[PDB]
Amino acid sequence: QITLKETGPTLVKPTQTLTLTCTFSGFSLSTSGVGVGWIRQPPGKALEWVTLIYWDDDKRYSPSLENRVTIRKDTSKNQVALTMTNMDPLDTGTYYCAHRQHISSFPWFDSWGQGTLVTVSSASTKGPSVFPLAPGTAALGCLVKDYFPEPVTVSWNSGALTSHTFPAVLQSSGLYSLSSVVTVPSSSLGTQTYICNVNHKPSNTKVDKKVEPK
Amino acid sequence: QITLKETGPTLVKPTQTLTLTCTFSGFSLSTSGVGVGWIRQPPGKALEWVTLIYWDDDKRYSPSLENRVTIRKDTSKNQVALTMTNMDPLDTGTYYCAHRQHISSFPWFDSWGQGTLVTVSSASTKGPSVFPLAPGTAALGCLVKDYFPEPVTVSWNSGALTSHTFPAVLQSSGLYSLSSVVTVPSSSLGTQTYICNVNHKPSNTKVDKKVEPK
Amino acid sequence: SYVLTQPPSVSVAPGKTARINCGGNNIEYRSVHWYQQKSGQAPVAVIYDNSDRPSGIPERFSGSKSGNTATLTISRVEAGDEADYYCQVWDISSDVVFGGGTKLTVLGPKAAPSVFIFPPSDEQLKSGTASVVCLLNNFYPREKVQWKVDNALQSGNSQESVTEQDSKDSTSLSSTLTLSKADYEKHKVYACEVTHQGLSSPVTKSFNRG
Amino acid sequence: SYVLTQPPSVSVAPGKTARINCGGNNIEYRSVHWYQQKSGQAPVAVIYDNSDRPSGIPERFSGSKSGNTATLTISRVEAGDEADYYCQVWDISSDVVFGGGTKLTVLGPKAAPSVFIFPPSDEQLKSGTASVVCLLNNFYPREKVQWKVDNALQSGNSQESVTEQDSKDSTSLSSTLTLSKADYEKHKVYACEVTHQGLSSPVTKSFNRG
Amino acid sequence: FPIYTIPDELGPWSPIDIHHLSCPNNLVVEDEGCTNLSEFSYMELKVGYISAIKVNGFTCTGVVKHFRPTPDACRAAYNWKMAGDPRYEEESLIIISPSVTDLDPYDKSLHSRVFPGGKCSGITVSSTYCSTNHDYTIWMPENPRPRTPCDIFTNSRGKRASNGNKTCGFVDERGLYKSLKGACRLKLCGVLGLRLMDGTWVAMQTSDETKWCPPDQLVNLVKKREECLDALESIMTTKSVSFRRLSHLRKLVPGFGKAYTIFNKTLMEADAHYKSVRTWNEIIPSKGCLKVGGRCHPHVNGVFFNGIILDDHVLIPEMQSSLLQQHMELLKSSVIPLMHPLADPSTVFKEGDEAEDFVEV
Amino acid sequence: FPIYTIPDELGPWSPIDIHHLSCPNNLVVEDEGCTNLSEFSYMELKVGYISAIKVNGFTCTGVVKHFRPTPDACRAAYNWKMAGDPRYEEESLIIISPSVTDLDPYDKSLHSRVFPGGKCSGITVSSTYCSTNHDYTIWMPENPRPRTPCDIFTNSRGKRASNGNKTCGFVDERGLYKSLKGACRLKLCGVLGLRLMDGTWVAMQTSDETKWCPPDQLVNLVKKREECLDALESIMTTKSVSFRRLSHLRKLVPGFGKAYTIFNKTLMEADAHYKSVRTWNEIIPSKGCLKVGGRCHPHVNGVFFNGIILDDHVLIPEMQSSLLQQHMELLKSSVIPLMHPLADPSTVFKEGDEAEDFVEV
Numbered sequence A, B: 001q002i003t004l005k006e007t008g009p010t011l012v013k014p015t016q017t018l019t020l021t022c023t024f025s026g027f028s029l030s031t032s033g034v035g036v037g038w039i040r041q042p043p044g045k046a047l048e049w050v051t052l053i054y055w056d057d058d059k060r061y062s063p064s065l066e067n068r069v070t071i072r073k074d075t076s077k078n079q080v081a082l083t084m085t086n087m088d089p090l091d092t093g094t095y096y097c098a099h100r101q102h103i104s105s106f107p108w109f110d111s112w113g114q115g116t117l118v119t120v121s122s123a124s125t126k127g128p129s130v131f132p133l134a135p136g137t138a139a140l141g142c143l144v145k146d147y148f149p150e151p152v153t154v155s156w157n158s159g160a161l162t163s164h165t166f167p168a169v170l171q172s173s174g175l176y177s178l179s180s181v182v183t184v185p186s187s188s189l190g191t192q193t194y195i196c197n198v199n200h201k202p203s204n205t206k207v208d209k210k211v212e213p214k
Numbered sequence C, D: 001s002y003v004l005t006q007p008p009s010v011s012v013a014p015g016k017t018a019r020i021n022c023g024g025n026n027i028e029y030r031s032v033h034w035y036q037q038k039s040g041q042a043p044v045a046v047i048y049d050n051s052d053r054p055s056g057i058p059e060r061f062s063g064s065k066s067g068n069t070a071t072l073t074i075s076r077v078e079a080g081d082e083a084d085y086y087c088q089v090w091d092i093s094s095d096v097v098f099g100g101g102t103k104l105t106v107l108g109p110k111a112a113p114s115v116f117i118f119p120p121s122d123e124q125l126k127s128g129t130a131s132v133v134c135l136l137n138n139f140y141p142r143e144k145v146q147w148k149v150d151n152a153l154q155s156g157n158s159q160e161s162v163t164e165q166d167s168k169d170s171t172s173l174s175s176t177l178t179l180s181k182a183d184y185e186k187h188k189v190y191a192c193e194v195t196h197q198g199l200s201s202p203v204t205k206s207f208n209r210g
Numbered sequence E, F: 001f002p003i004y005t006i007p008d009e010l011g012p013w014s015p016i017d018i019h020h021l022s023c024p025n026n027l028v029v030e031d032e033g034c035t036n037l038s039e040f041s042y043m044e045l046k047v048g049y050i051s052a053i054k055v056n057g058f059t060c061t062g063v064v065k066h067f068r069p070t071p072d073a074c075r076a077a078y079n080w081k082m083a084g085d086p087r088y089e090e091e092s093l094i095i096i097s098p099s100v101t102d103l104d105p106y107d108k109s110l111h112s113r114v115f116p117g118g119k120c121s122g123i124t125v126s127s128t129y130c131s132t133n134h135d136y137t138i139w140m141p142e143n144p145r146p147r148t149p150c151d152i153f154t155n156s157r158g159k160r161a162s163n164g165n166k167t168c169g170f171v172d173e174r175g176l177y178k179s180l181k182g183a184c185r186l187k188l189c190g191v192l193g194l195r196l197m198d199g200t201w202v203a204m205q206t207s208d209e210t211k212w213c214p215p216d217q218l219v220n221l222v223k224k225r226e227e228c229l230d231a232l233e234s235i236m237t238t239k240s241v242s243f244r245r246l247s248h249l250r251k252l253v254p255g256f257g258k259a260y261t262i263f264n265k266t267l268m269e270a271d272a273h274y275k276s277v278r279t280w281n282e283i284i285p286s287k288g289c290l291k292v293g294g295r296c297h298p299h300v301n302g303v304f305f306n307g308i309i310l311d312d313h314v315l316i317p318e319m320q321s322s323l324l325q326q327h328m329e330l331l332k333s334s335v336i337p338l339m340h341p342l343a344d345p346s347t348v349f350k351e352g353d354e355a356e357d358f359v360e361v
């Protein structure tokens, strides 16, 4: 049926301009009753409508957000653009792009792109620092701290190891850190050596780290 | 005045043929009373006459040696050749080439080339093994053992060291060994490091060795 | 600003019917919309215009309204329709306003967590910033991690990450302490307290500097 | 074979006259020749035809004969005309025969040797052939080095090298023992005995395996 | 001793475990006065059959919780596991490949630690399955009916050496003197050859009588022999191996020998003819290139054989532990730097016209 | 911390001994919000005068066995020793060059450990010879009449940074941010410049008032500061240095610093502006080539500066002690290699239909 594709800069610096583009197939932005919205949801927080534009270049705006957002239509391309000025870090979130149902009088979104992940942070791309988290089973892990451009790929013994990589929380310094951990036979400790393979493609910092008990 | 120059193979294998060439300026092998001899002296042992040839291609021979030596004249080149068959190791020695005084009735050599050092040994060219000889003065040294083609150049701390390298004695295995030793301040031991630079050009085996007390 | 309320965290009996209220000024005259958002997914509309269902939403979901408080009732609850449920309406204030979500929780089985602690590496005690780590795994329900640095409570200074429901079990998390290398060299007792339902006693694994 | 005798090692009083005899059959009728050979140099003729001197040999050297025993006398001896002195004659047997040399020794001052010993390297006790070294220096006269391996005499098994008269002093040598690595691991007392004129007592520096 | 020994020719790899390992034979024999050399042709065991004649099989066991399994129904599931289509569904027979076993020259029995007594008499038309230590577990071969391999030799041309009318050693096509001293007769494919050194199996055309090999030995700085056995004992206690302790099992002198390596947590061995290496450069000439058999050797996820691994840089365990000791040493070398006399804090001056000890005249 | 710091520009070498040595200043200061950058030109101390203003002299002493010597007759023999013709004959005056002494910006006194109090007021027309710790030993300069050097500067062009109307740091012609934080005024040649960091002496055209440098400091992983002081104490007990303990005295961060080396048993130092090295390759690209100042650096008998020496291969003390620990480590990595179940000597089988622990389903 209908499909909507958000595109844009995954990452934008605070006080810069963000500009995203929903591209959409199933329907007609040139009809007399449809509209294309943006709803954004900061991670773990509740949905927040951001803007809507209708077939007659009427541009609805969330009141909280009106002074920064700028919405635009082109229905020759089947594209809507969303343009937010003076990016603030709280604006980090997923930006969904949605289709407003056109028969129904009060507005509601039936179609919703799997939305894009906008992250507004001020950090130069910096590689990770990868520290070891040493140990009828025991457990060991890697601590990848202070990586900035997420994501980080932690492999274990060359991904030859099969059994919990964690998500990243934004630190007090606008940098990210995530930690990967494995359960091995308690007997292999001090006999089978364990090395985690960490790659921060952003800075193409590749580092492997040997993790053993004291 | 007269000058005589031995030339030939410094080294010959036992049971091979040795052939040496005395070349000589001051005098006339084409006169009617002169002759050109060979006297050889094994190292540290007494002189031993070997052959003599006179202006009339008369070839005197030492009786002990006649069955192997072969002497020859060419006075067109001012050269005499000495040719010894079936080289035996005892024949190692210096081969002097001398001029027989031509007025004097009983034969005696007035002129004598600084003679050549014939060494008849069966060993393939093999580099040295350089061992350390560790320690109001104390003394330390290098032991260069089992070098075959003599000579060996022992330098000390890059010949930056200034104060007894020894000659080589033929071992029980037809190989040579020589040892170089230095007197340093007894206080420098364990503070100034001492390295001997040994080069066996024959096998271009260069080896430097650190010599310190235990 | 306009606002319409819906409770956080309703809790249901699996296989029973559930009921979430959305209430806001003059809902009797606007029409109210209802969205299910499963974890990490984009929202899907479950009912619209008060009581209508999309072409593929099961009859179990329903919605109806009385007065200025509308409500979607999920009859015969399964465990997969456990999600954030948002309601939404038009106002004068904005065109579309969303109730802050309601987390339906379906329940019923109680697990327990294994507690490993990880001191800061000698690599990180050479940076000046140590970091202590407390990893729990396999617990369910999901909800309390304290830090005893020289037996003394440490609050306001850690962060926490987690993974979600495991593909098989449904039970995980990572606690992280930040001292300075002088705060590490000056306290000896280093512990991690833990509180959960299957736990009959508050768990703590401790370590000293050596 | 023909042979003519001359003594090894005549010894002179420096500044006195010296006399070496060469004697062989019928020397009264052949004529006899005399050669000085300084260390490492090729021989130089000093007198020929019994009593004649080369153009540059000093009148000090002379030679004369009586009966079948000829002799060169070096009057007013210096220390530099200290050398091997060969005599030489024609025979029927060969054209030229040399007396085995006579070593003139000029004397008079007595030194003493310093004795360092050097065990075999751990590099050489890994080959299986150890080697022990005894280095003496600065002695004069030049002439006896024994080896005490577990206090027991060791003969027939060492070799020896030396340098010559030093440019300044005139005084040096290297003794070398060859055991096998089982003969090294099985004896403890490892010594070097030394005998010289300035020595009032026979010197020995000993070492054990450690 | 050469600085290193590298293979010149390396057979196929075979899976083995830590028990199959064993220190190398490093023996070398000169032949003295063996210098009449005559050009000649002869045969030789093809690399990969020299150490032994492997013969692959598999392990079929039974479950449903154990039952003794049936061969054709096991054989059935070998073929399945070959594609794993109706295999992983599964009354269940569980199959493990490959079970390398060795072929006994004398009784054509198969050896393997799996077998009771470590032997099987053999598989034949009527005996289709060997029995193992485990009751509900059998062994069958890759083949339905295995056949003694007889295409196992190479043709070769060396020069042979004879001190007298009798001959003593030869120089193989790779140039290395092999002495017939110590060799016994060994009957391969109805040919009577000499096992020479490390199993070197040659067959001449000229036949002199010689002692035979006993039916017991028939399958598979002397300090270094004990430096190595320590590594093996070090391995077996831990039941764990390291590339460092791997590089000790290398034949230290040129001639036949096994080479070892490890792929994807799987230990492997292979036949190899070692060549002495005069300088580290001749085997490592490039950044990631290991010259062996005149080309650059392929690596499996950065692992070459004999502990040699791969920063994108070929590191040799014996090479690395040298440069580190070589370099480290020069870096620790010392000096007394010159100091001016008058430049010292504490230089006591002796009063009077007594001239100090500046001996520069 | 960068992986290494290499000079970009290296002044002349000066003879010094072990006392002149001293750990490096590794301090680094960022300047925050200092981002208005404006193009600008300025002056700078020519490398080789930055750390100090050396002024060479010599040591004339007296003998015949001591006597206090006379200057012109000493000066006489300096000129002789210059050729050593009527020199080595020798009533005798013995001369030692070169006596480096340092020029004091404030009182134009000369410093050197040779001098009583470690100072000389100076040489002038009437004072032609400094006196030393030793009574019968004097000091005179290479010059008859030395002159304060005033051709000591370079012209340079950087970009300067100002957080606000006031400016805070600049980026020198070699690209490195230098912060004016911590700098004091210092009067060179009648110009009032800033000593910046490690003595960095720049003179701007724009003048803001700033605190002066005191007449005492006027001449010449904080763990690493103590890692280094150990090396210095290690050196001074022994009165001996090693290339290993030499490479600790290297400035670990980019900016001004002294570099040390040793030639022919003679210790030497020189001014240097360090550049951070991101990868070992960018400084060692060839077999014996050390890229510094964009060319390959000359060595003196295999010795480059800062412990870097020369197998025909450039080895870096800090590089070498890394690869050895890096490589050695991979080589010691371990594994448990797979073993077949039935392949064990001691595998107890539990009798009965009890299925063993092969968990492969």
Ligand SMILES: *[C@@H]1O[C@H](CO)[C@@H](O)[C@H](O)[C@H]1NC(C)=O
Binding pocket: A160, E264
């Ligand atoms: C064997 O290696 C391959 C790479 O070629 C890898 O993908 C695979 O997972 C490995 N096998 C196992 C069982 O891990």
Ligand SMILES: *[C@@H]1O[C@H](CO)[C@@H](O)[C@H](O)[C@H]1NC(C)=O
Binding pocket: B160, F264
């Ligand atoms: C200084 O080095 C040179 C080599 O250029 C060397 O020949 C000289 O002997 C050295 N100086 C001293 C005093 O050894």
